[PDB]
């Protein structure tokens, strides 16, 4: 499968999540995603084909994971934007007020600005600390997807938000949205990964 930020993948033929970013670990290919999407060794599929398994994750506390893929997958330095693509150029962290977009299988590519950093989400499973908050909307299924600037600087992966009864926070004003992402930097150093760029 072609691995691009934002596309859907399933875990153990049940849940759906979105791909965050293509990365490598030495000769191993992988992608970073949300920790709440799977447990170590869970199987990931893309378009009904097995592509790899969860190699590690932390959730709750943090919300991160990486899936190691088979040799046959094609990693690309790109994030889905409808039928087009945003090229990943690096991982400079943007500051509060920067504009940012996110991509995932449920709401597509949405943009907004970062409103706060170091936020705690109180999930049923336990607290998740250190999240960055943006006001781009998102829905159930967007988790693990990419957060990136239009300039191609990868910011992190989708963790959660104040989803309403329709499954997203897209029907409420930007002013009232809380969409949280796990920072990419600590995920790359924690697992020794390098981002694929173009």
């Amino acid at each position: 499968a072609n691995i691009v930020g934002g596309i859907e993948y399933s875990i153990n033929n049940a849940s759906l999540c979105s791909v965050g970013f293509s990365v490598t670990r030495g000769a191993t290919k992988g992608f970073v995603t949300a920790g709440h999407c799977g447990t170590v060794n869970a199987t990931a599929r893309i378009g009904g084909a097995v592509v790899g398994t969860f190699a590690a994750r932390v959730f709750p506390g943090n919300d991160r994971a990486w899936v190691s893929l088979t040799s046959a997958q094609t990693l690309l330095p790109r994030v889905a934007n409808g039928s087009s693509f945003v090229t990943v150029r690096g991982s400079t962290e943007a500051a509060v007020g920067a504009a940012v977009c996110r991509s995932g299988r449920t709401t597509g590519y949405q943009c907004g600005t970062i409103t706060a950093k170091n936020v705690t989400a109180n999930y049923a499973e336990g607290a998740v600390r250190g999240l960055t908050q943006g006001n781009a909307c998102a829905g159930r299924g967007d988790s693990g997807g990419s957060w990136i600037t239009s300039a191609g600087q990868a910011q992190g992966v989708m963790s959660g938000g104040n989803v309403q009864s329709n499954g997203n926070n897209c029907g409420i004003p930007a002013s009232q949205r809380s969409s949280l992402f796990e920072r990419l930097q600590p995920i790359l150093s924690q697992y020794g990964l390098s981002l694929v760029t173009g």
């Binding site: 999930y123 159930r140 989708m158 959660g160």
Partner: peptide, 4 residues
């Protein structure tokens, strides 16, 4: 907030 909820995960996703």
């Amino acid at each position: 907030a909820a995960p996703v």
